[PDB]
Amino acid sequence: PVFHTRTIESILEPVAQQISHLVIMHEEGEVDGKAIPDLTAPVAAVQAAVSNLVRVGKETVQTTEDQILKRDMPPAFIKVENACTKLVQAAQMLQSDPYSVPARDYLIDGSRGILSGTSDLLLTFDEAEVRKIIRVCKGILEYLTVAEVVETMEDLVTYTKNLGPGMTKMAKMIDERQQELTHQEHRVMLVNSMNTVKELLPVLISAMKIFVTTKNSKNQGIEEALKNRNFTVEKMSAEINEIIRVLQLTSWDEDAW
Amino acid sequence: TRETIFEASKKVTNSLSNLISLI
Ligand SMILES: C[As](C)(=O)[O-]
Predict the structure, then answer these.
(1) Does B8 contact A39 at a Cβ distance shorter than 8 Å?
(2) Fold of domain A1-128
(3) What value does the CA radius of gyration of chain B take, rounded to a whole number of Å?
(4) Do A57 and B5 count as a contact with CB atoms less than 8 A apart?
(5) Helix A153-178 to helix A184-217 angle, to the nearest 10 degrees?
(6) Kind plus residue range of the DSSP H or E element containing A174
(7) Which end of chain B is more exposed for a tag (fewer CB within 10 A), N or C?
């Protein structure tokens, strides 16, 4: 199986691979003539865990201001609850008739449903983390649009003192995100893009210092200095937009649950 | 100090894994 992040992989494994296997062993049809042992107590443990998960999820629904969580968490609760009802039914059916083929299939379907709803909740939380990172990226893009307004050395010192720490915060968030992505190609793209942006930052500040000097001296170097600053801002902005794009990618190879 | 969604989800998948280990 291929998951989006190491957090999700750490939770969905080992059961995702177990269910993936069990489905190949019981595609649909299930003619083995074997009995399933009493699942009443193991199923009661799943039901208790599912009810607890829905309770915990509802704490976020009741407190969050993020409307995309209030919208996406409740359908996952319904999926796990309905899937668990199937699992309880299946265990009751199998306790009455351990050799039942139709019940073994409620059982497998209920298990898939629990895994799917749990995966949906985890992806909702993941998507909210990504939105938080993108807000920071967009804030840097916005402050980069202010570079063109800087026409004095005092304003350049102020600009540098605001942008440096902001870029450090963005870099920290990208570093913390990339480290847990499972796709090496995406980690490499994020690390390379963030390094390009970090390397362009002193180039930008230097270009702004040249622009301010040319402005103050009222010399013939202003249009060249301005174009060189704009070129650097354009490249930094293109790179941050590439980060934003990579942060939202889901590879074709990721298993859907 | 309250249980996280991650801890609660791991309880779910552990219990589901333990159940499936019986088939
Ligand atoms: C943790 As780093 C690669 O942004 O210095």
Answers:
(1) no
(2) Four Helix Bundle (Hemerythrin (Met), subunit A) (1.20.120)
(3) 11
(4) yes
(5) 180
(6) helix A153-178
(7) N
